[PDB]
Amino acid sequence: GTSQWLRKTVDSAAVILFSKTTCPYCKKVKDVLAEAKIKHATIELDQLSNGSAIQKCLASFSKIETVPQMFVRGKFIGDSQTVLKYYSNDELAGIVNESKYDYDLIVIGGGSGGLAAGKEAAKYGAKTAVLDYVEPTPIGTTWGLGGTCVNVGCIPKKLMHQAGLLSHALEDAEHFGWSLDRSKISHNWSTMVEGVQSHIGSLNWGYKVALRDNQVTYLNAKGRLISPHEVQITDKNQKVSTITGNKIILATGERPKYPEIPGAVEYGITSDDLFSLPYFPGKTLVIGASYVALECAGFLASLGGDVTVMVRSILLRGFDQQMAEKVGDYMENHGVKFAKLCVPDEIKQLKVVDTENNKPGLLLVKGHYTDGKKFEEEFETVIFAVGREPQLSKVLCETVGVKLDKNGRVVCTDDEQTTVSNVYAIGDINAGKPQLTPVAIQAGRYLARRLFAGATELTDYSNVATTVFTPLEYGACGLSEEDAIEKYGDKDIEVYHSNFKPLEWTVAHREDNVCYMKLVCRKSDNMRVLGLHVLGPNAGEITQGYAVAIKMGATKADFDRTIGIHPTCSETFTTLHVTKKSGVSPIV
Amino acid sequence: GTSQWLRKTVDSAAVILFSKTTCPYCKKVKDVLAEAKIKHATIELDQLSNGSAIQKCLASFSKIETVPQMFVRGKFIGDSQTVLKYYSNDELAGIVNESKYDYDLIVIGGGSGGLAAGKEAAKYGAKTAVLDYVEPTPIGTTWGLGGTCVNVGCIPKKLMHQAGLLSHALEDAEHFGWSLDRSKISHNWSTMVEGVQSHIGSLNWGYKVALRDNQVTYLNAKGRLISPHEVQITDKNQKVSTITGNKIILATGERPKYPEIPGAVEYGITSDDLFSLPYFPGKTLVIGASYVALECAGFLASLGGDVTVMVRSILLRGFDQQMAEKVGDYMENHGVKFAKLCVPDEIKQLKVVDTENNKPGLLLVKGHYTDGKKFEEEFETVIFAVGREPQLSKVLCETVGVKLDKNGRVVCTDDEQTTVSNVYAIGDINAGKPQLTPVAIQAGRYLARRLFAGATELTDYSNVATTVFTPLEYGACGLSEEDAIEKYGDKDIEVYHSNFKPLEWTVAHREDNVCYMKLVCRKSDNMRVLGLHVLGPNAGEITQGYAVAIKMGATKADFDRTIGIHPTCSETFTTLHVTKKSGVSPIV
Ligand SMILES: Cc1cc2nc3c(=O)[nH]c(=O)nc-3n(C[C@H](O)[C@H](O)[C@H](O)COP(=O)(O)OP(=O)(O)OC[C@H]3O[C@@H](n4cnc5c(N)ncnc54)[C@H](O)[C@@H]3O)c2cc1C
Ligand SMILES: Cc1cc2nc3c(=O)[nH]c(=O)nc-3n(C[C@H](O)[C@H](O)[C@H](O)COP(=O)(O)OP(=O)(O)OC[C@H]3O[C@@H](n4cnc5c(N)ncnc54)[C@H](O)[C@@H]3O)c2cc1C
Ligand SMILES: NC(=O)N1CCN(c2ccc(F)cc2)CC1
Ligand SMILES: NC(=O)N1CCN(c2ccc(F)cc2)CC1
């Protein structure tokens, strides 16, 4: 038990010191390592439950049981006297640097998970390389270091969401006594894209500075694992070479899909292209019904665009469908048009994009509805948001032995290990996990600590909260109502719910009964809260704190005995009492 | 145990039915009761663990052990056959209305607590009266039903805070691509006040409708308790009379204090006057440093005013002082002037308020700093925010025997009972309790259920979260850092903290390291979170959900294992790691 943990820690750590906070020979070794700029992990035995047992297990590697023991890459290096001997004879640098591999860790993919893993590993003395490359889109769009969320995801899409929210703030301001005239104000797309892109550029540069300051080697190159320890790299000049590493982390992410129809690749775009587009999209068709599809359609309409969404079946498949319907109904009342039960058959080009005068082209979209009727209409821009997929055949030679599932994602143990013992996978390519930026970051940092600092904590992937940043936002944590009913039966499920109205909406004359919240609870388990759902402003800020309580097993009685903060939207969760079974209206 | 509960429940319930969900004779009685429009409490014995014991205890009152059994004001009325006999003989109506008093419940005070208590009691059949009166301010200001929060508190102050927040939204809009010119836009005070007051008026009316629809008698009269069961009332024609009630709830609240200096009452105003003022205050001095003082100074500055705050000693006495200093520094960097360590000596009138042209007057303020130097400056408006106090020698004859503390608040047991057995107190006048609207509402509703429906649940007053709505908002739950250190010692306290920057502030070029958050934890109790603090936008929405986790005993490990929602401000709580003891900078 203790002995198996110690064996695993010693074999995998790059540089580690076993110590006690109270020993001056420890302190003497720490100071030498600091002065020579040797980073390392440290385990203070006097602050662990069974540190006395660990102290005795170390003798199986060092033949000693005493204070100060330093190891390098699985090898006992010495006690206090021996380390200082190496320091005084200028032998230490070569000892801490000798390795059978070029790197202790190679990270393939420089995004949310990969950068977090690489920076964390280097803090404990692991010699680390991070590889990142951005394959251009069909029209040629490319970007810098940081991954999907930083460049073409959460960061730019929430900034453009905020630009959309400010249109209603302009409207509201007149009712609160400000003298502007909303009807006389317009939006400039390229001015907003320039501000968004300047912030993204400061993030690209910040990550490059962070890697340099942690002594991480950054290679802007495409990586390919050709055997358990060998990574083939190709650079911007198509020069090819090979580097080796002890541990490997796969963190290459996904890219958008295109449907298999004429004209889609040639004449449509995706979210990869939208966030740096040099011209306003104009009259726009969004094909798809994911959160990506609805978030993009929502802010385009708030910025003054003429927007239509083509929905194959339902909105937000996999989310609570009552909440999904309320989200779509709000968008439809505030401008967005919906072509329901409809799919596209072909895109025809009518005008080429005017790259000179900075204007979109013009397209003819032909499709059909699920009963057979026809769809035909012209648009200036067509955006595909019909899902995302990894392309691991680009990354991973089949002979290496890493097992994939039927969707091409990596099959992992609960500690992110693949079917190849030294190879791990994190982020969106880890099969079956929520595909979210904070999950990738936690997985990457927690893994680096297990590999290189002797930690044991695993990532917990259950009950991870979400927020869809549609014009009226939707936050959730836990099960949808229909999933709870399927798992436990309707008779064992109680749902408390209410409409509400933000105080900010009263003077602004906004809608009385559109915001909505509910708690889905299990009767036979002390009214345990299985899922929480809220539609309203600032939904992500509302939901986050409740995720801690749900992690600890909150019940309805816990929400009842907690007192609200007034005046807020969030406080409505503390006084819910209308049940769905009762049939009493939730309006206020 | 069971028998003492049953006797207390039977003695004080107005109309109560003991029942079982499965018994058709009970259903037969229920149907009769609401056809005759008789409201009542119900206790379903099959839904309780010791229902068999309660059923045997009922025989001590009725001489029978079966269900249904119906009681009125402590008296057994009959089983199914007997109730129906009274019904078909038109005797039932007189039975259920027979009382030794005019009312089952008289509530003195029609505010947050009193309205909540009165409506809840009437739902279980208590015949209820709610008394409310508004003593005019020195300049004559008065308002309608609903109490301090609704008319001169939480509601108008947050609407005016929102008006101030919208000025920075106008500034931000240009950076996000909108074409307005912030420098050419101004604010109209009276347009704002008209919109605020129209919403307040809809609340006044809504409460009167609510009382009518719950069969509660509303008396717009001043009440005075002259003996345990006797309330003397004085109406708006100075007509005086007496009403009697079984239970009495005191819920009369507080009003603002004035300092004992010349000119203060004659020429200054308080928050009671500010929210309906017919002219913009102009150049304004705020005397005081409470949350009321800083919130009012904050929105007046955002609306274009020239504002000074005169601080006797410290800001936000009783709140965490690091956070208080950050709140004030932000205010001072955005225009609010502070006269520190300074008190007023006299207010001189230079111009009378111009009631025709709708303009303030002009005042000379003279004061002094604690070292003796002099303060002298002119202002158009002087607002006193130097505390609030009850005036129970106005509500309560000393001969009744209700004990007060040295500050004039009512001394109560943990079930809100005064030293007079039928008299209870809720809300701001209950000594030692947090003075907040949701606390008063919870106390009132829970008390009504114990009096008239046999409930046992008490109000929990510990770890109640707060938010101060200054221009940058400050939310908190639990102990300040200095209180935690005093209680447990500095070596048992660990503080995790970080600055942050809202994503919304990046493109808008707002400040990098002004928002701030920390967790104050107890080392020897598994790093229990003793206090949570955050300074930033939407701080009340951020804080609320974590108050459930703190109620449940959250530790630092609970925050660490919960995953963040991205991009939000709140997610920064899920990844904190810099400790104060380490000396590492919290900047980002
Ligand atoms: C439009 C959109 C909006 C989103 N909004 C949110 C949101 O609000 N909140 C949220 O939590 N999540 C959001 N997400 C999801 C989030 O972006 C992902 O969950 C996250 O980026 C996954 O991180 P990752 O490390 O797995 O991969 P990525 O961030 O995709 O990084 C992988 C990197 O590796 C590179 N790479 C690929 N192959 C190779 C190779 N062979 N060699 C070298 N480098 C390679 C890729 O080009 C990329 O730069 C959004 C996603 C999209 C598309
Ligand atoms: C400026 C300001 C801002 C505030 N902001 C917040 C905030 O954001 N959040 C928050 O939680 N709290 C806030 N508060 C506090 C909140 O207003 C109080 O905690 C709450 O109103 C107390 O309710 P209550 O029922 O105890 O008394 P009140 O609401 O004051 O109601 C008592 C009522 O009884 C009446 N009355 C008095 N004497 C008699 C009598 N003899 N006969 C009949 N009627 C009588 C009074 O006129 C009044 O109408 C604020 C307070 C102020 C002053
Ligand atoms: N034919 C190929 O296999 N690719 C590999 C990736 N590619 C590249 C481009 C830019 C960059 F900065 C890094 C790498 C070059 C061509
Ligand atoms: N004790 C007195 O001298 N009363 C106090 C009550 N006051 C009044 C005014 C308006 C109202 F609607 C109800 C009552 C009149 C004078």
Whether B494 contacts B579, CB under 8 Å: yes
Ligand 4 lined by B235 (C-beta under 6 Å): yes
Expressed in percent and rounded to 5, the helix, strand and coil fractions of chain A are 35, 25, 40
* Residue ending a domain, choose from B96, B125, B150: B96
- Closest-approaching ligand to the CA atom of B143: 2
- Choose one of A97, A125, A140: the last residue of a domain: A97
In a shared domain, residues B380 and B479: no
Q: How many CA atoms lie within 13 A of B147 on its CB side?
A: 24
- Cβ neighbours, 10 Å, residue B353: 19
Cα separation, B562 vs A552, in Å, equals 9
Q: Looking at the CA of A145, which ligand is closest?
A: 1
Task: Using the Cα atoms of residue B228, residue B230, residue B236 and residue B238 in order, give the sign of their dihedral.
Answer: negative
Q: Which residue of A has its CA nearest to B575?
A: A442
Nearest CA to ligand 4 atom 12: B236
**Domain match, B531 and B486 both:** yes
Residues B233 and B153 in one domain: yes
Documented resolution in Å: 1.8
Within 6 Å (CB) of ligand 2, which residues are found?
Answer: A 566; B 108-114, 131-134, 147-149, 153-154, 157, 222-223, 251-253, 271, 292, 395, 427-428, 435-438, 440
Q: By 3-state DSSP, what share of chain B in percent is helix, strand and coil, each rounded to 5?
A: 35, 25, 40
Mark whether B233 and B135 lie in a shared domain.
yes
Binding-site residue ranges of A for NADPH: 157, 289-290, 292, 312-313, 317, 387, 435
CB A533: neighbour CB atoms within 10 A? 26
Cβ pair A552:B541 closer than 8 A:
no
Beta bridge partners of B261: none
State the ligand closest to the CA atom of B393.
Answer: 2
User: Encoding tokens for residue A23?
Assistant: 């020993």
Question: Does B467 map to a domain?
Answer: no
Span from the CA of A115 to the centroid of ligand 4 (angstroms):
71
For B408, counting Cβ atoms within 10 Å of its Cβ (0-12 exposed, 13-18 middle, 19+ buried), the class is middle
- Which of A163, A166, A565 faces B543 most closely, judged by CB atoms? A565
Phi and psi (nearest 5°) for B369?
-85, 160
CATH code of the domain covering residue B76 = 3.40.30.10
Nearest ligand to the C-alpha atom of residue A134: 1
DSSP 8-state secondary structure symbol assigned to residue A315: S
CATH of the domain at B480: 3.30.390.30
Tokens for B272, please give them.
């009671």
CB-count exposure of residue A209 (10 Å: 0-12, 13-18, 19+): exposed
**Gap from B445 CA to chain A (nearest CA, Å):** 11
Residues A269 and A363 in one domain: yes
Atom of ligand 2 at shortest distance to CA of B111? 31
CA of A151 from ligand 3 middle (Å) equals 19
Strand partners, A37: none
Q: Does residue A581 sit within a domain? A: no
C-alpha distances (whole Å) from A29 to each of A21, A47, A68, A70 are 12, 19, 8, 9
Residue that is last in its domain, among A436, A462, A488: A462
Distance B396 CA to ligand 4 centre (A): 16
What distance in Å separates the CA atoms of residue B252 and residue B585, rounded to the nearest whole number? 49
Contact B567 A538 (CB under 8 A): no
Residue B585: inside a domain: no
CB A178 to CB B166 under 8 A? yes
Q: Which of B108, B226, B234 to mutate to test the pocket of ligand 4 (most atoms within 8 A of CB)?
A: B234
| B45 in the same domain as B150 | no
Ligand 3: which of A238, A240, A241 to mutate, most ligand atoms within 8 Å of CB? A238
From chain A, the residues in CB contact with B478 under 8 A are none
Contact B110, B211 (CB under 8 A): no
Question: Which three-class secondary structure state does DSSP give residue B581?
Answer: coil
Q: Does one domain contain both B370 and B271?
A: yes
DSSP string of B18-86?
EE-TT-HHHHHHHHHHHHTT---EEEEGGGSTTHHHHHHHTHHHHS--SS-EEEETTEEEE-HHHHHHH
Most distant CA pair in chain A, distance: 86
Residue A445's closest CA among A82, A55, A116? A116
Q: Give residue B240's identity as a one-letter amino acid code.
A: V
Statement to judge: residues B335 and B393 lie in one domain: no
Does B545 contact A540 at a Cβ distance shorter than 8 Å? Answer: no
Ligand 1 atom nearest to A435, measured from its CA: 19
Q: Which uninterrupted H or E stretch holds A156?
A: helix A154-175
State whether A177 and B199 contact (CB < 8 Å): no
B533 and B547 in a single domain? The answer is yes
Q: Which of A176, A179, A299 to mutate to test the interface with B (most CBs of B within 10 A)?
A: A176
Q: Is residue B360 part of a domain?
A: yes
Out of B235, B237, B240, give the residue to mutate to test ligand 4, the one with the largest number of ligand atoms within 8 Å of its CB: B235
Q: What is the 3-state secondary structure (H, E, C) of A103-145?
A: EEEEEECCCHHHHHHHHHHHCCCCCEEEEECCCCCCCCCCCCC
**Whether B504 and B553 share a structural domain:** yes
What residues of A are annotated to the active site?
A: 566
Answer for the pair B484, B518: CB distance below 8 angstroms, yes or no: no
Q: Does B231 map to a domain?
A: yes
Residue nearest to atom 27 of ligand 2 (CA): B253
Give the Cβ contact number of residue B581 at 10 Å. 11
The token pair at A227 is 């055997």
Q: B180: part of which helix (H) or strand (E)?
A: none
Tell me if A170 and B173 make a contact (CB, 8 A cut-off): yes
Asked, for residue A586, whether it belongs to a domain, the answer is no
**Buried residues in A108-137 as b, exposed as e (16+ CB within 10 A):** bbbbbbbbbbbbbbbbbbbbbbbbbbbeeb
Domain containing B81 equals 2-96
Nearest CA to ligand 4 atom 5: B222
Verify that B378 and B396 share a domain, yes or no. no
Is B462 contained in some domain? no
Pick the residue from chain A with its C-alpha nearest to B187.
A178
Residues with Cβ < 8 Å from B202, sequence gap 6 or more?
A: none
| Domain count of the fold of chain A | 4
DSSP structure string for A428-486: GGBTTS---HHHHHHHHHHHHHHHHS---PPP--SS--EEE-SSS-EEEEE--HHHHHH
The Cβ of residue A243 has, within 10 Å, a number of other Cβ atoms equal to 19
Same domain? For B64 and B130 the reply is no
Q: DSSP letter at B136?
A: P
Asked whether the beta carbons of residue A438 and residue B180 sit closer than 8 angstroms, the reply is no
Residue A156 CB coordination number (10 Å): 22
Residue in chain A closest to B570 (alpha carbons) equals A541
- Distance between A494 CA and the closest CA of chain B, angstroms: 16
Residue of A163, A507, A538 with shortest CB distance to B176: A163
- The CATH number of whichever domain residue B301 belongs to comes to 3.50.50.60
Residue B188 in domain: yes
Q: Please compute Rg for chain B using Cα positions.
A: 28
Q: How far apart are the first and last CA of chain A?
A: 58
What pairing do the DSSP bridges indicate for beta strands A337-340 and B466-468?
unpaired
Helix pair angle (A291-302, A154-175), 10° resolution: 40
d(CA A555, CA A570): 17
Distance B465 CA to ligand 2 centre (A): 18
Q: Does residue B566 carry a catalytic annotation?
A: yes
Dist CA A413 CA A406 (whole Å) = 17
